[PDB]
Subunit: 82 residues, 2 copies
């Protein structure tokens, strides 16, 4: 699952920057840039969830339309049976 | 889905009864007529179940989304604390 891999690698990337700050705290422009890259990645995750809610509402709508079509085919058939 | 198969199958049954009426403007034999009534019964119960399953699907998928949102909020918290730590260098 793509979503889970992105979450994992980002998690991982964040732990690396953290460890890097720890070692350098015990001991800049690049960290600021990396954090901007990560903020962008996270907004993309947010967007992908939104797309997912949309697509699933569409799948649901679509299934409901199929069941209603069967209902209509049954009703036409009952009438025809009369 | 199995949903899609059930739809497939139920439409097929509907078609077979239609074709059956076409071949019989008056009653076929008792056994034939009763089998048809049973198929109508089957179809009717299947509708209730198909409807019910759409409810379960919406539920399940809503849970999947909530899960994903919680996962993103965790990363975001993890980033925001790092940003502050970086600020305090």
């Amino acid at each position: 699952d793509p979503f889970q891999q992105v979450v994992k690698d980002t998690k991982e990337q964040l732990n690396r920057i953290n460890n890097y700050i720890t070692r350098h705290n015990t001991a800049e422009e690049e960290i600021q840039d990396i954090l901007k890259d990560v903020e962008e990645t996270i907004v993309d995750l947010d967007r992908s969830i939104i797309v997912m809610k949309r697509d699933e509402n569409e799948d649901v709508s679509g299934r409901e339309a199929q069941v209603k079509n069967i209902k209509q085919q049954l009703d036409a058939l009952k009438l025809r049976f009369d």
